[PDB]
Amino acid sequence: DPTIFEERHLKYISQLGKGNFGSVELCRYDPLGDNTGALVAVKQLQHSGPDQQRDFQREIQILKALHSDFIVKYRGVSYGPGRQSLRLVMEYLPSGCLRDFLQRHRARLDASRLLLYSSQICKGMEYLGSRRCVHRALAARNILVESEAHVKIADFGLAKLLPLDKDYYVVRQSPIFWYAPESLSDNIFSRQSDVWSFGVVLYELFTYCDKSCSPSAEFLRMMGSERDVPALSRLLELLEEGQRLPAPPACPAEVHELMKLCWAPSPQDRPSFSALGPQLDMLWSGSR
Numbered sequence: 397d398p399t400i401f402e403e404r405h406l407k408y409i410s411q412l413g414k415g416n417f418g419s420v421e422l423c424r425y426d427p428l429g430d431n432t433g434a435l436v437a438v439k440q441l442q443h444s445g446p447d448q449q450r451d452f453q454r455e456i457q458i459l460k461a462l463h464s465d466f467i468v469k470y471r472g473v474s475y476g477p478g479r480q481s482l483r484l485v486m487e488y489l490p491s492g493c494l495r496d497f498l499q500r501h502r503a504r505l506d507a508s509r510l511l512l513y514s515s516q517i518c519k520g521m522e523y524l525g526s527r528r529c530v531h532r533a534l535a536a537r538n539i540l541v542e543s544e545a546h547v548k549i550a551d552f553g554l555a556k557l558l559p560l561d562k563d564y565y566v567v568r569q570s571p572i573f574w575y576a577p578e579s580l581s582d583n584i585f586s587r588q589s590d591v592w593s594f595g596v597v598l599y600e601l602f603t604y605c606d607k608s609c610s611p612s613a614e615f616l617r618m619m620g621s622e623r624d625v626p627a628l629s630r631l632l633e634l635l636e637e638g639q640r641l642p643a644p645p646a647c648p649a650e651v652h653e654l655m656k657l658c659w660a661p662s663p664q665d666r667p668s669f670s671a672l673g674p675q676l677d678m679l680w681s682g683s684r
């Protein structure tokens with residue numbers, strides 16, 4: 397099996413990302429032991445009990461089964477005698493995440509390129525949808541840059557498959573400003589709750605992930621004068637009153653319209669990724 401990587405030939409280099417229960421590390425797979433082997437991204441767990449190990453095994457099986465140009469590529473696993481020694485080996489994308497890329501190259505990325513990224517993310521999300529996978533972490537920081545015109549969805553740590561007989565599932569630290577109100581209120585997740593997140597992703601792209609325009613900064617602006625109202629409680633009120641993130645300056649009207657539709661109160665009033673994609677394509681392809 398070329399998908400089995402020998403733990404002893406994985407040489408640690410640096411950290412790519414960190415969560416509460418895991419890290420993704422840059423490593424070299426160096427079976428010749430002369431430091432010429434290929435670089436890979438390797439996820440492993442820390443501070444993990446059975447639930448986290450169980451979620452990690454699911455993550456491995458999910459990603460291994462996805463074959464899309466817009467989803468980060470599974471390469472294999474590693475293991476050893478060690479208790480927490482199971483690792484997920486993925487492709488390494490050295491241009492990093494889209495959030496950083498947009499902040500760094502803002503000046504040279506026009507609305508046409510942002511449209512292109514939007515279209516690609518949407519297609520990877522359509523691909524997930526057709527496999528009944530709810531991603532749950534869809535944000536610019538979890539999208540990778542393969543090249544200047546090619547992005548890929550990553551961080552499957554929270555991804556979960558829908559049952560064959562329901563179109564949602566329920567769970568028992570969430571990025572609150574990316575989450576659908578039913579997910580924050582009632583822990584209901586669906587492909588339509590990923591549509592909501594995608595709308596915040598649009599927001600990010602067309603603000604170039606600028607920190608002064610971030611969802612959290614806008615929230616603090618909209619918050620009103622009572623600054624000791626717990627964020628989640630006040631966000632739920634604001635969303636229930638019909639308040640939404642404002643249109644960025646870079647935003648064409650049509651993209652702002654799609655954002656607002658992604659943020660329809662009822663999940664069932666939100667467009668599917670299949671309905672969004674052709675609209676983003678009209679705009680993108682029509683902006684070449």
Ligand SMILES: N#C/C=C/c1ccc(-c2nc3cnc4[nH]ccc4c3n2C2CCCCC2)o1
Pocket residue numbers: 412413414420437468486487488489490492493495496537538539540550551
């Ligand atoms: N804001 C912000 C910063 C985000 C950031 C910095 C570095 C990375 C990152 N580079 C990677 C390169 N090859 C990779 N293969 C699979 C995941 C992966 C890489 N990630 C992960 C993406 C999300 C999960 C953890 C880091 O993201």
Ligand SMILES: NC(=O)Nc1ccccc1
Pocket residue numbers: 573595596611612614615618634639640641659
């Ligand atoms: N989807 C959406 O509009 N979310 C939101 C609204 C107000 C402040 C922060 C985030």
